[PDB]
Predict the 3D structure of the following.
Amino acid sequence: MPAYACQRPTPLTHHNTGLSEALEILAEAAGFEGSEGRLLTFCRAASVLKALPSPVTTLSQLQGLPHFGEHSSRVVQELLEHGVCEEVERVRRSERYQTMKLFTQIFGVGVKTADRWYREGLRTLDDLREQPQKLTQQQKAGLQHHQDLSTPVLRSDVDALQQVVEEAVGQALPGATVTLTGGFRRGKLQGADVDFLITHPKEGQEAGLLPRVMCRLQDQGLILYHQHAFERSFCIFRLPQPGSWKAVRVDLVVAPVSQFPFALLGWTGSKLFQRELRRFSRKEKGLWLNSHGLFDPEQKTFFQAASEEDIFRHLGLEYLPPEQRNA
DNA sequence: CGGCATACG
DNA sequence: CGTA
DNA sequence: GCCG
Ligand SMILES: O=c1ccn([C@@H]2O[C@H](COP(=O)(O)NP(=O)(O)OP(=O)(O)O)[C@@H](O)[C@H]2O)c(=O)[nH]1
Ligand SMILES: [Cl-]
Ligand SMILES: [Cl-]
Ligand SMILES: [Mg+2]
Ligand SMILES: [Mg+2]
Ligand code: NA
């Protein structure tokens, strides 16, 4: 078992679901308290279990696994012995955890805002609605649309949405393309949103594209919310339903075709996979990775990539398809 | 102990 | 600060 | 919280 998640296949479904979900509660709770290091260890421990070829049935099977020390091992031990971990249940039940979870789920609210509101005594969505003066326009939208946005987007929803985006993109710039990325590209059957990557085969033609796309979508009546030169858009989209419609989150990003492999890798995730891949690049290979490129700071040169495969090869890593990046 | 991914709106 |  |  290698120490970095980008060094091993992680499938979407696996053999240690209950154990990884318990560790991810502790990870989440760590984040709500601002402990990014603890969050990372619990996420990595969880992810290690996702990568195992069979269920953990005894504590000894943790020996030598990376990211399992005293704390994570005890969590697993208790689940194996009793079916529950007391620390985990205590977190689940706590007012702090439940309210930070509820508040950070709102589009436009992060940990810092949730925490402030929590300290101010606020606890429910209706608490927030009563004092609407204190909300940003983004948060107002997030709160109005919260019920719809809390329902999963279905894979079976995605194609219709992609078609609508393609129509607008084609008018904005003939020849421009739309690629499904994010969780659905990793094989998820549901998601919190739909993430699309846009480019054009002629380098440079994509400059100024996203505002054109957004204005067209808004003219079609499809945009319930968006922030408006830019290259990322975080929207709320109108998605048809039987006799009605629902709000869904849609992310759009534009990249030049030279950067497309880096953007595709970066947006396809998982989020933990990308963090680990970047950490690996920098700490093991001395190369700086982001969604735009891969930089050698000694030669002061960028690696040209024509494919994700190129990028894995330049990092000396075995290729992982998107389905195996579910760290 | 230091480090923990990296960027855009 | 928010967001991916 | 864990790794190197
Ligand atoms: O903090 C982040 C968030 C997101 N991302 C990158 O952006 C991608 C989409 O970010 P996302 O929030 O849409 N998550 P996703 O994996 O699609 O699952 P879901 O919750 O169902 O939408 C993620 O999969 C990462 O590749 C980051 O790199 N860092
Ligand atoms: Cl589906
Ligand atoms: Cl980036
Ligand atoms: Mg997504
Ligand atoms: Mg997204
Ligand atoms: Na939020």
Remarks:
- Residues 36-37, 39-41, 227-228, 230-234, 253, 266, 271, 274-279, 281-283, 288-292 of chain A lie near DNA strand B (CB under 10 Å from a C1').
